[PDB]
Design a protein around this ligand. Structure first.
Ligand code: 0C5
Length: 263
């Protein structure tokens, strides 16, 4: 097995509520990874141990270029430790901060990337995946990596939206307190896309109530610059009726992705 003793520790990459990810490397190989740390005292008090202990064993087996891989795991006494793949470029969220908006080739490829991943996950009987910008990391050169899994961590920036960034990525069926299925993720996708192009999410608002309203009532508009095929895509994505949303196939088929996608 492994222990904290096989790792050198660099900066914390980000700091979560139940713990942090630090930059790390195995001591022999000097091969770099990321160490997610979890207080476990902070943990069970949220009721999560036994569900974490399986939910590691999904993200352990999962393997894919656009999914951040979990190499191994260990606990000690007071802390739980996820050995993670390191993503050099960090979070799409910061990138979005910097560029203020993305372009179409970016978006379309990221979107392709995302859709590949979920498709794969679906096949493994995995859903629900929470992918907002801050959960998405940028791998070696350009890629996109679904981090998800570990309770979301932050690297200092903004102050703005602290929480109040929550709701925007939730589909009407989740916030309404109904059930949900593979189709949640297609809503999310539609929301990512829009944000990518817009710089803000489709449902952004000053209160959770008004956010909630817009979400469930699917009231969202595009600014000038969006292109019809862009509209077509998100539109076909954000549909109150989960059934009226695609499977990922038609997403990856869609006329506008294939046009501007580098992938
Ligand atoms: N998800 C997520 C997440 C969000 C914020 C901070 C860390 C997270 N988890 C992981 C894990 C492995 N590599 C990385 N790569 C990374 C690289 C750079 C930064 C940064 O410059 O600030 C942050 C993260 N991040």
């Amino acid at each position: 097995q492994w222990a904290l003793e096989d790792f050198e520790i660099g900066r914390p990459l980000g700091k979560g509520k139940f713990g942090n990810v630090y930059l790390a490397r195995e001591k022999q190989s000097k091969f770099i990874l990321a160490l997610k740390v979890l207080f476990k005292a902070q943990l069970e008090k949220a009721g999560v141990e036994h569900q974490l202990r399986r939910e590691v064993e999904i993200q352990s087996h999962l393997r894919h270029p656009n999914i951040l891989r979990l190499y191994g795991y260990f606990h000690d006494a007071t802390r739980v430790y996820l050995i993670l793949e390191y993503a050099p470029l960090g979070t799409v969220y910061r990138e979005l901060q910097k560029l203020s908006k993305f372009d179409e080739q970016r978006t379309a490829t990221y979107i392709t990337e995302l859709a590949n991943a979920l498709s794969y996950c679906h096949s493994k009987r995995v859903i629900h995946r929470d992918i907002k910008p801050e959960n998405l990391l940028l791998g070696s050169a350009g890629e996109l990596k679904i981090a998800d899994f570990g309770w979301s961590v932050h690297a200092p920036s903004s102050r703005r939206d602290t929480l109040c960034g929550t709701l925007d990525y939730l589909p009407p069926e989740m916030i309404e307190g109904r059930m949900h299925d593979e189709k949640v993720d297609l809503w999310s996708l539609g929301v990512l896309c829009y944000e990518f192009l817009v710089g803000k999410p489709p449902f952004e608002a000053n209160t959770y109530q008004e956010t909630y309203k817009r979400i469930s009532r699917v009231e969202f508009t595009f600014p000038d610059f969006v292109t019809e095929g862009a509209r077509d895509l998100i539109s076909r994505l954000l549909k109150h009726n989960p059934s009226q949303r695609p499977m990922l196939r038609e997403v990856l088929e869609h006329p506008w992705i294939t046009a501007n996608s580098s992938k």
